[PDB]
Ligand SMILES: Nc1ncnc2c1ncn2[C@@H]1O[C@H](COP(=O)(O)OP(=O)(O)OP(=O)(O)O)[C@@H](O)[C@H]1O
Ligand SMILES: Nc1ncnc2c1ncn2[C@@H]1O[C@H](COP(=O)(O)OP(=O)(O)OP(=O)(O)O)[C@@H](O)[C@H]1O
């Protein structure tokens with residue numbers, strides 16, 4: 001038995017009693033301070049019983065709950081998605097076991113000082129890696145083939161190049177990049193705790209495979225050929241969230257873009273068939289022969305298709321740009337004019353612009369989705385889903401409702417308490433919530449209801 | 456109109472850095488495999504062709520300067536290959552890949568960002584104007600609360616909740 005636990009229980013009893021006594025309410029207010037400690041370690045939630053009645057539960061916060069990370073909290077709060085009924089409770093509750101496993105990993109990790117310290121500088125390791133990769137690629141670009149502190153680093157690199165040489169500078173930079181990427185991967189695993197789910201889950205994790213590929217590329221740059229260092233420049237997309245969104249603008253409707261490209265290819269095949277059938281003599285292409293200056297590019301259907309696809313798409317005016325220039329007196333001049341105008345209109349003006357139109361549409365779609373998600377998150381309760389306008393002209397404000405009454409993290413703390421507490425010691429509401437969790441029922445989370453609003 | 460471009464200038468610059476990285480990769484490939492094809496015509500002030508891929512730096516400069524500025528891409532300036540050559544399919548794939556990846560997509564991301572910014576500015580301006588016109592500055596009540604009331608919204612904002620008062 002610990003006096004602190006008994007004091008906390010008596011404090012919870014006093015808090016419950018103070019609802020009907022103003023003197024107790026005043027005395028329990030904190031001015032080291034026992035009241036302040038109990039107040040920072042006490043939490044409260046609202047639950048709905050079988051009889052659709054709302055009850056306020058006050059419980060002490062489990063000790064393991066102090067190890068939850070602000071990055072994990074922000075990530076959950078910003079990624080949790082609504083369900084068909086428009087409720088985030090399903091996903092937020094589904095992540096509870098992962099949250100508890102993360103708390104236990106953090107508690108285990110903080111006992112290992114070196115590894116915790118290494119895990120605390122993941123951003124530093126990544127920045128160092130990116131800077132080394134940029135410098136290596138710049139040196140390669142500017143010297144290949146051969147034979148803030150950033151200004152200081154550039155000066156040291158110039159001095160190393162001037163004294164030792166480009167090869168030795170590149171070798172030192174590569175070794176440093178490899179050591180730093182290894183430290184970064186060790187820090188990444190120690191922090192994210194991805195092994196906690198399992199070796200299968202860790203392998204399935206895309207970030208971990210991306211880092212492993214980074215490591216392999218760095219090894220290849222160091223040993224096989226320095227030119228493999230260029231691939232590391234792709235880390236810019238990983239590092240930048242705006243560039244990633246810009247690329248998403250294109251990768252969200254990639255199926256649409258590819259179908260448009262297949263449609264362009266089909267129109268090119270048809271135009272090549274027509275040209276082979278009727279304009280064979282007009283496909284004369286000039287050629288710079290290495291040590292005649294023109295060749296026929298439509299003697300076979302395959303080659304004609306290749307010529308059209310390669311040149312008409314890449315020419316502003318279309319296929320007609322590369323074709324032999326016809327004389328007005330020729331009997332096929334109107335046919336050629338119709339051919340050229342039809343290709344330029346159908347393929348260049350319309351089909352080639354469908355890809356850019358799809359990209360623009362995707363841009364707008366991403367903008368609208370992001371705005372809607374931000375609006376919902378900012379102006380709606382995470383748990384109950386009530387809007388800010390329901391709390392206007394109310395004793396309790398929306399901010400207090402989300403800070404004290406329906407705190408999702410307080411609900412998580414209750415779930416962890418129900419998980420850690422022995423079955424024999426459960427109270428009424430603890431047992432009800434445990435039974436509901438066992439039965440896979442979320443009706444105990446409030447929904448569009450608030451005790452402060454109704455009373 | 457200039458704000459339409461300067462609001463997401465970071466996005467434009469990141470797109471340009473991405474274009475530069477693709478140009479660096481394409482230049483590396485060309486130097487490794489298409490060195491002989493980088494022949495550029497030159498008007499010498501008082502031979503008429505020069506090799507523009509003898510070093511990686513110069514090749515990068517050539518690609519960045521000409522392939523971005525040419526509608527058809529880098530393939531426009533490269534030596535024209537004969538179908539009988541054993542590298543003709545490689546050259547075709549090179550040219551189509553550069554024109555598709557760099558010109559069609561990457562160069563259009565800047566214009567797409569500009570258009571998106573245009574729309575964002577339009578929507579923000581409309582929302583701000585609507586709020587200002589149809590909401591009380593002080594109390595924030597809308598016009599629809601004053602319908603069928605002795606005191607109208609205009610009188611509420613002119614006499615009752617005057618910010619200048
Ligand atoms: N149900 C909810 N609806 C909306 N926002 C919520 C909800 N629960 C928590 N938040 C927000 O999530 C963030 C986490 O709140 P939290 O209780 O952790 O406060 P804190 O300021 O980080 O902690 P402390 O001040 O007690 O050290 C805060 O922005 C809080 O407003
Ligand atoms: N709280 C408010 N909400 C909305 N509009 C307001 C508010 N207070 C003032 N305004 C508007 O701001 C402008 C300034 O009003 P102001 O009292 O100065 O009237 P004025 O016509 O300029 O003066 P006067 O007629 O007395 O010489 C007017 O358009 C008024 O409608």
Ligand SMILES: [Ca+2]
Pocket residue numbers: 424425426
């Ligand atoms: Ca009991």
Ligand SMILES: [Zn+2]
Pocket residue numbers: 381382383384385386401402406450
């Ligand atoms: Zn609530």
Ligand SMILES: [Zn+2]
Pocket residue numbers: 591592593594595596611612616
């Ligand atoms: Zn008012």
